Design a protein around this nucleic acid. Structure first.
Lengths: 113, 103
DNA sequence: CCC
């Protein structure tokens, strides 16, 4: 069972330029009706320890004490990936509603929505 | 110069629809977010997906914007421009994205 | 330049 705003570890694939890659935490941003459906995949935003040299308006600071990640991290709202559900076995934690609202504002900015 | 609603051929070979907004497209950001286009007619039946009749885009076949297939690509890998998705259909794409992402 |  995968839910929006949950954080998982995921393989993002081999490196290719600045494409998301390697094993990283990811934040599920796909909505729960799709998460509960027969759809094989989930959309997520990539989390990094910081966004040094990739600092975008809309990026969101995630305190370690709020997410259960080992360190303070950042949601990179311009780094979006689609992953297989069956590959999301490694559950880390979650982002609370108040902070997820900031993530949503960032995504709306990035996608002109 | 990459703009929202443009269709490009991309190595994932598939057509992709730029959904990243133009301030980010014009910035030094190295990447662009896109929705994957497919010519599998069955996917027209998935809620949120947007049907693109061949005559509405310059693609060779009837296609579908798959709003659940989102990729982030290097800008420099978007060289092969097809055209644009017209405003009317882009509004449907936006609605689909809002549904899929709870936005 | 899907099946």
């Amino acid at each position: 069972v995968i839910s929006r705003a949950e954080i998982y570890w995921a393989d993002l694939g081999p490196p290719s330029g600045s494409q998301p890659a390697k094993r990283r935490p990811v934040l599920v941003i796909q909505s729960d009706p799709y998460n509960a459906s027969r759809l094989a995949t989930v959309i997520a935003a990539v989390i990094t320890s910081n966004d040094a040299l990739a600092a975008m308006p809309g990026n969101v600071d995630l305190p370690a004490t709020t997410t259960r990640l080992p360190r303070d991290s950042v949601v990179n709202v311009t780094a979006i990936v689609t992953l297989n559900k069956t590959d999301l076995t490694d559950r880390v934690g979650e982002v609370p509603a108040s902070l997820m609202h900031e993530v949503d504002r960032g995504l709306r900015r990035v996608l002109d929505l």
